[PDB]
Amino acid sequence: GAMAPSYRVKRMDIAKNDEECVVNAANPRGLPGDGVCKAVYKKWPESFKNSATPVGTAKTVMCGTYPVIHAVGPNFSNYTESEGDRELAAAYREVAKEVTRLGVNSVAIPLLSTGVYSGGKDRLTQSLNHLFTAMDSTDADVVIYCRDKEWEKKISEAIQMRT
Ligand SMILES: O=C1NCCN[C@@H]1CC1CCCCC1
Ligand SMILES: [Cl-]
Ligand SMILES: [Cl-]
């Protein structure tokens, strides 16, 4: 565990993370994909061997000894708000199980079901609150990665608000 488990946010490419493992915002088919998933495929392509997994699940594949946790959030273009909300919560619960099982002291994580799976809606608060619900009972240092300047400020505010 971390000596004083924390949450932090950085605005940069998650492929450059300084953590003991990474969460990929994966598609269900283990394809290279776009955005975070494409950055992850360029950096850790070996981790896409048998990485396909259903929506609302996470599947870890090692790139050497570096664990890549493929977490499949719902595409809100296809899911109802209700059913998508349930699957997004579930994906983060499976991430917390994997982080625990791996025994890492730190994890780099993106906000799932944002970007091209958002169905054109701002889901910062929805996705971040499901991340906290899952990760708050773990003792890993969590480092959230984002690309937008305004999102960085809002995520940082939400972290600082809880203290
Ligand atoms: O998921 C995102 N991350 C950074 C901001 N851009 C998208 C969400 C936007 C979709 C279109 C309408 C406005 C919100
Ligand atoms: Cl960068
Ligand atoms: Cl972002």
From Swiss-Prot:
Residue ranges annotated for the Macro domain, each copy included: 4-163
Effect annotated for changing V36A: Partial loss of mono-ADP-ribosylhydrolase activity
Residues annotated to bind ADP-D-ribose: D13, N27, G35, G115, V116, Y117
Parent-record interval covered: 1334 to 1493 of 2474
Post-translational modification: Phosphorylated by host on serines and threonines.
Description of its domains: In the N-terminus, the macro domain displays a mono-ADP-ribosylhydrolase activity. The central part called, the alphavirus unique domain (AUD) has a zinc-binding function. The C-terminus region, also called hypervariable domain (HVD), is mainly disordered and binds several host proteins. This intrinsically disordered domain contains 2 SH3 domain-binding sites and 2 FGDF motifs necessary and sufficient for the formation of nsP3/G3BP complexes.
Subcellular location: Host cytoplasmic vesicle membrane
Species of origin: Chikungunya virus (strain S27-African prototype) (CHIKV)
Subunit record text: Interacts with mRNA-capping enzyme nsP1. Interacts (via C-terminus) with host G3BP1; this interaction inhibits the formation of host stress granules on viral mRNAs and the nsp3-G3BP1 complexes bind viral RNAs and probably orchestrate the assembly of viral replication complexes. Interacts (via C-terminus) with host G3BP2; this interaction inhibits the formation of host stress granules on viral mRNAs and the nsp3-G3BP2 complexes bind viral RNAs and probably orchestrate the assembly of viral replication complexes. Interacts (via C-terminus) with host NAP1L1.
Stated role: Seems to be essential for minus-strand RNAs and subgenomic 26S mRNAs synthesis. Displays mono-ADP-ribosylhydrolase activity. ADP-ribosylation is a post-translational modification that controls various processes of the host cell and the virus probably needs to revert it for optimal viral replication. Binds proteins of G3BP family and sequesters them into the viral RNA replication complexes thereby inhibiting the formation of host stress granules on viral mRNAs.
Protein name: Non-structural protein 3
Membrane topology: Peripheral membrane protein
